[PDB]
Structure 1
Amino acid sequence: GKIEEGKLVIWINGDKGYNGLAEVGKKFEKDTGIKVTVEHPDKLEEKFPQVAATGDGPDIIFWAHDRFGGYAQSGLLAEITPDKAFQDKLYPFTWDAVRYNGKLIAYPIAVEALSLIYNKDLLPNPPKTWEEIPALDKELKAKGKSALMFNLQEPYFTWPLIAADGGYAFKYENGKYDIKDVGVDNAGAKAGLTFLVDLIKNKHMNADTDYSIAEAAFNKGETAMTINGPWAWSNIDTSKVNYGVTVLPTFKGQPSKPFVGVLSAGINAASPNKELAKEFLENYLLTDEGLEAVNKDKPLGAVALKSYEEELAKDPRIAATMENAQKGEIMPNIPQMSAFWYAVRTAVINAASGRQTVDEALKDAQTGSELYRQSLEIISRYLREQATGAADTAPMGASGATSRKALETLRRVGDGVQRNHETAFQGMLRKLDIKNEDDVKSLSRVMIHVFSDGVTNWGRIVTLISFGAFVAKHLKTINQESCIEPLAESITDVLVRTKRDWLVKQRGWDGFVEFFHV
């Protein structure tokens, strides 16, 4: 449960150039005597937050930048403080992708976007539109081939099509996100996912196709096209398929919009090797020779280092990567990105398999993506109005009827719980000795341990939130009102992390209102 001093452990995904990264590690070891271990665990982006929360895990984690905001919000990443001379060596927009709440929380490595990859011997002119792919598949099936195979198990690969006609994750306008404006179940998202499901229904695609199946079929020449990123080009090179990399097809006349990732390297906040890690990343990896070693193993895409990016910029495959990137959007790094991806992953799999209709699947994904912010709105408002005696006048915003009605239900049932359970609430408020902001941050572990043991139902959720209001009242009297919002965030985090699937099954806070109706 403690990271070892005097070595570096690095985690990177198994589709990236980890043997090349290990070569950089060997060069580090030659200068310093410090051994560098590169590992590629399964589901490392899910494992890192669990093990790092205990003070364990790798010294350095590599992932696309979208997951790092969550890690940073949880206190799991060291702040990065490169000097100006180093910062100036990387493109400013890559640093922007690894900024969270004003601080740099990772080193950017390379810019990744999906492209259409096609077999020039089968398909001299790849299709410009998604709509022409069914007819192309029919032509190719008559030749013992198929038009298109790509990974249908990870929503990253289907998102460019879902977004094309108007789907979006979190709305971006006037230089900032509106986290409460989620675009997963609108008409444009439905149109794109319906087109995907229709491709499967019409036998142009198979719902069970995953990364390995699609890669094998393309690299053996059975399918004329795939959708993948730069890391995949190495294995196609080895297959000697005559391939090209080009712009994704349009849908309803609009570009496919891939979510653009910046592969990034974060330092574990619990690492006793932060100076070594910074030395490795700045003076070994993020150099022309270090990125070359990784890129020669599995291509990185458009690297963040200006000097080496210019050296590779003439590669037509990189130009296509950046053309598709310009038509897409840089992913947010907000902490709810993990929940968004989990919700949309399930929606695509369920729609593709027929377990849910497109309408059902996207509705559930919308609820899952909105769950944190909607829960916080309700919980923060209830705690604050209970503590101060006066309600928040600010508009509820999106799903404001749901929030207003849930808050109204909570006012009824939560005030009764606080009345009837004053005895236990007073007793618990003594055992916990909450005096300051530091005491509040300590509550999450006891909260999780009590709340995640036993039956799940709305009554216990009312008890969780009602005791929160009881504590908010206390915080107000000891002149610690500024601790109420952090407390509300902590309660919300416990609720939505421990009860995500159950909450979505109940239709979220709409199920709460109907459970307690009349």
Structure 2
Amino acid sequence: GKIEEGKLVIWINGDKGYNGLAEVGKKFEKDTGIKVTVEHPDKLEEKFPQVAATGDGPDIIFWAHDRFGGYAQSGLLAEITPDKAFQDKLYPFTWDAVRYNGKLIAYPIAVEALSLIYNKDLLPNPPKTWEEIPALDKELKAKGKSALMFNLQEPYFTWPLIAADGGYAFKYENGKYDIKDVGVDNAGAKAGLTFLVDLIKNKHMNADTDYSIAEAAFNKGETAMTINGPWAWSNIDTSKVNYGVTVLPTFKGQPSKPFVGVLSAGINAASPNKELAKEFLENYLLTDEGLEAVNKDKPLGAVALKSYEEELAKDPRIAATMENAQKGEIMPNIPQMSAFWYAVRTAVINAASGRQTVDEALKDAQTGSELYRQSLEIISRYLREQATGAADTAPMGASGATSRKALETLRRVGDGVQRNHETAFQGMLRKLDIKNEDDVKSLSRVMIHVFSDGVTNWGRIVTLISFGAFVAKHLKTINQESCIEPLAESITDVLVRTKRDWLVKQRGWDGFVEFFHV
């Protein structure tokens, strides 16, 4: 579809201050005559990339910054170009959160971190350690209360415990991510998730607890503690619970490490209202008055706007938010975050329910989180060596035996396919008439149509990749060798997005190697 010119449609999550945001919209309308519609659809972070890819969706999307790199990589976001005067009004680290491939892709709004929230009438002093919670629950159960309830359906809430003893998403060293180094199934991650599963086994928590259930229990005074972000404080205020906000408990003597989000506002690349969107965000929302309107509805956390943050920083709840943030880590914004979160979501739910053991659950999560990078390594190497006649001398890196053996297998089976099906391959090549980088960009749709709509098996995956090598050879011969790595990226994207679940179920590329073992 087509986004309508002369209005603004905004999407924001239903846990945020969307009524406050709508008030800012009304102020904008009063000056400009432009109606601002604020919506909070379910699963908006999944809906956005689907609808925006067709030139549809909201003019402005609000989410934590972690999702925005994927959106930017997909061409769904307009580049943000504020002047120096405006940029200087926000904290530099918040702009860093919304930078992707050297470009600003959103406006930062506020810094969010989970804290421990406790009922002072039940628990005058909160526990300093996770390890003491079982004994505390026993004391409280005898009085008809429980120690702790929080959302076990979203891995955002369990991550601080998984990370505490050494779990990590993507390793960060010497000022850089090693995207090849994933820390989801190490001893530290296992210890944290085992502690969570044991809480459930011992009836201190219930696997089915979600956001609404935990919120209701805390706000009714039934449970002594919860884990939540600043947005939750409004409903607690309304409940009149005598609450405190504090540092998360330690695990094995180490801080809980929340993944820190920067609520950010991106402009849809398909919007015909980009100038209106920039005006709204810079001159209405990111002002003391604008942020106050949203914050009074549901608190934002530590806002990006320096002038207003100076007022808010005096609040002990914000001090606690920032203490927890400093103990955690700013989320990456790399496109692979979506897959990481899906993988860990499934692991936590399956481990909590008993569907998988902790070891089984985190193994699958590691495979899911590594899948893009490993698939690209294999596919890129095969395409490039096929096109040039010479292999890549670079070390395979992480999980290198699997990558090496997969590439060996692919050489054997993929060369066979190209030989036996040379006629069909040559015919399809000529039909597609691939001349340049723009023509390569058009293949994704065709690949999804032909590949993804068909039986899922390793044979069809070999055809996908082998035909890719056939195209790569063609690109080299016509002096378009620069198109090969984009092509490999495109093939990988199609494969891992459309066959994610199946691939993880096969043990990924180890399954491929076993399937074609001579």
- Is the shorter-chain TM-score for this pair beyond 0.5, marking a shared fold? yes
**Using the alignment, how far apart are the partners of 1:498 and 1:179 within structure 2?**
21
1:472 to partner: Cα distance: 0.3
- Write out aligned runs for 1:380-395 (5 A): 380-395=380-395
Deviations 1:487-514 (A, max 9, x none): 0000000000100000000000000000
1:173 to partner: Cα distance: 0.4
Deviations 1:334-377 (A, max 9, x none): 00000000000000000000000000000000000000000000
1:141 to partner: Cα distance: 0.2
Deviations 1:212-265 (A, max 9, x none): 000000000000000000000000000000000000000000000000000000
1:266 to partner: Cα distance: 0.1
1:352 aligns with 2:352: yes
Deviations 1:26-84 (A, max 9, x none): 00000000000000000000000000000000000000000000000000000000000
**Using the alignment, how far apart are the partners of 1:64 and 1:224 within structure 2?**
28
- Write out aligned runs for 1:103-142 (5 A): 103-142=103-142
**Using the alignment, how far apart are the partners of 1:509 and 1:497 within structure 2?**
15
**Using the alignment, how far apart are the partners of 1:117 and 1:467 within structure 2?**
55
**Using the alignment, how far apart are the partners of 2:402 and 2:305 within structure 1?**
47
Deviations 1:368-397 (A, max 9, x none): 000000000000000000000000000000
Deviations 1:402-437 (A, max 9, x none): 100000000000000000000000000011111011
**Using the alignment, how far apart are the partners of 1:453 and 1:487 within structure 2?**
20
**Using the alignment, how far apart are the partners of 1:455 and 1:217 within structure 2?**
47
Question: Which secondary structure state, in structure 2, belongs to the residue aligned with residue 117 of structure 1?
Answer: strand
- Write out aligned runs for 1:11-90 (5 A): 11-90=11-90
**Using the alignment, how far apart are the partners of 1:453 and 1:440 within structure 2?**
20
**Using the alignment, how far apart are the partners of 2:487 and 2:502 within structure 1?**
23
**Using the alignment, how far apart are the partners of 2:24 and 2:415 within structure 1?**
61
Deviations 1:186-218 (A, max 9, x none): 000000000000000000000000000000000
Question: Which secondary structure state, in structure 2, belongs to the residue aligned with residue 385 of structure 1?
Answer: helix
What percent identity do the matched residue pairs reach? Answer: 100
**Using the alignment, how far apart are the partners of 2:403 and 2:453 within structure 1?**
27
Partner of 2:406: 406
**Using the alignment, how far apart are the partners of 1:315 and 1:240 within structure 2?**
18
**Using the alignment, how far apart are the partners of 2:281 and 2:17 within structure 1?**
15
Question: Which secondary structure state, in structure 1, belongs to the residue aligned with residue 134 of structure 2?
Answer: helix
**Using the alignment, how far apart are the partners of 1:431 and 1:305 within structure 2?**
55
Deviations 1:131-158 (A, max 9, x none): 0000000000000000000000000000
1:272 to partner: Cα distance: 0.3
**Using the alignment, how far apart are the partners of 2:250 and 2:154 within structure 1?**
20
1:90 to partner: Cα distance: 0.1
RMSD of aligned residue pairs (Cα, Å)? 0.3
Deviations 1:98-133 (A, max 9, x none): 000000000000000000000000000000000000
**Using the alignment, how far apart are the partners of 2:9 and 2:453 within structure 1?**
34
1:454 to partner: Cα distance: 1.8
**Using the alignment, how far apart are the partners of 2:302 and 2:311 within structure 1?**
10
Question: Which secondary structure state, in structure 2, belongs to the residue aligned with residue 493 of structure 1?
Answer: helix
Question: Which secondary structure state, in structure 1, belongs to the residue aligned with residue 248 of structure 2?
Answer: coil
Partner of 2:256: 256
1:317 to partner: Cα distance: 0.1
1:453 to partner: Cα distance: 1.4
**Using the alignment, how far apart are the partners of 2:425 and 2:223 within structure 1?**
64
**Using the alignment, how far apart are the partners of 1:302 and 1:312 within structure 2?**
7
**Using the alignment, how far apart are the partners of 1:2 and 1:309 within structure 2?**
38
**Using the alignment, how far apart are the partners of 1:362 and 1:461 within structure 2?**
26
Question: Which secondary structure state, in structure 2, belongs to the residue aligned with residue 442 of structure 1?
Answer: helix
**Using the alignment, how far apart are the partners of 1:216 and 1:151 within structure 2?**
11
**Using the alignment, how far apart are the partners of 2:425 and 2:463 within structure 1?**
10
Question: Which secondary structure state, in structure 1, belongs to the residue aligned with residue 369 of structure 2?
Answer: helix
**Using the alignment, how far apart are the partners of 1:421 and 1:50 within structure 2?**
34
Deviations 1:287-344 (A, max 9, x none): 0000000000000000000000001110000000000000000000000000000000
**Using the alignment, how far apart are the partners of 1:111 and 1:7 within structure 2?**
28
Question: Which secondary structure state, in structure 2, belongs to the residue aligned with residue 454 of structure 1?
Answer: coil
**Using the alignment, how far apart are the partners of 1:434 and 1:320 within structure 2?**
57
Question: Which secondary structure state, in structure 1, belongs to the residue aligned with residue 343 of structure 2?
Answer: helix
**Using the alignment, how far apart are the partners of 2:141 and 2:105 within structure 1?**
49
Q: Which runs of 4+ in 1 moved over 4 A?
A: none
Question: Which secondary structure state, in structure 1, belongs to the residue aligned with residue 499 of structure 2?
Answer: helix
Q: How many residues align?
A: 518
Question: Which secondary structure state, in structure 2, belongs to the residue aligned with residue 249 of structure 1?
Answer: coil
**Using the alignment, how far apart are the partners of 2:154 and 2:220 within structure 1?**
22
Deviations 1:456-500 (A, max 9, x none): 000000000000000000000000001000000000000001000
Partner of 2:150: 150
1:452 to partner: Cα distance: 1.4
**Using the alignment, how far apart are the partners of 1:371 and 1:133 within structure 2?**
36
The runs of 5 or more residues in structure 1 that have no matched partner are none
Partner of 1:468: 468
Question: Which secondary structure state, in structure 2, belongs to the residue aligned with residue 151 of structure 1?
Answer: coil
**Using the alignment, how far apart are the partners of 2:426 and 2:178 within structure 1?**
39
Question: Which secondary structure state, in structure 2, belongs to the residue aligned with residue 124 of structure 1?
Answer: coil
**Using the alignment, how far apart are the partners of 1:477 and 1:417 within structure 2?**
21
**Using the alignment, how far apart are the partners of 1:427 and 1:105 within structure 2?**
41
Partner of 1:444: 444
**Using the alignment, how far apart are the partners of 2:2 and 2:288 within structure 1?**
34
**Using the alignment, how far apart are the partners of 2:444 and 2:370 within structure 1?**
22
**Using the alignment, how far apart are the partners of 2:54 and 2:451 within structure 1?**
20
1:183 to partner: Cα distance: 0.1
Partner of 1:273: 273
**Using the alignment, how far apart are the partners of 2:220 and 2:410 within structure 1?**
59
Question: Which secondary structure state, in structure 2, belongs to the residue aligned with residue 177 of structure 1?
Answer: strand
Question: Which secondary structure state, in structure 1, belongs to the residue aligned with residue 111 of structure 2?
Answer: strand
Question: Which secondary structure state, in structure 2, belongs to the residue aligned with residue 260 of structure 1?
Answer: strand
**Using the alignment, how far apart are the partners of 1:462 and 1:486 within structure 2?**
19
**Using the alignment, how far apart are the partners of 1:343 and 1:516 within structure 2?**
26
1:400 to partner: Cα distance: 0.4
**Using the alignment, how far apart are the partners of 1:354 and 1:219 within structure 2?**
29
**Using the alignment, how far apart are the partners of 1:47 and 1:453 within structure 2?**
21
More moved, 317-326 vs 445-454: 445-454
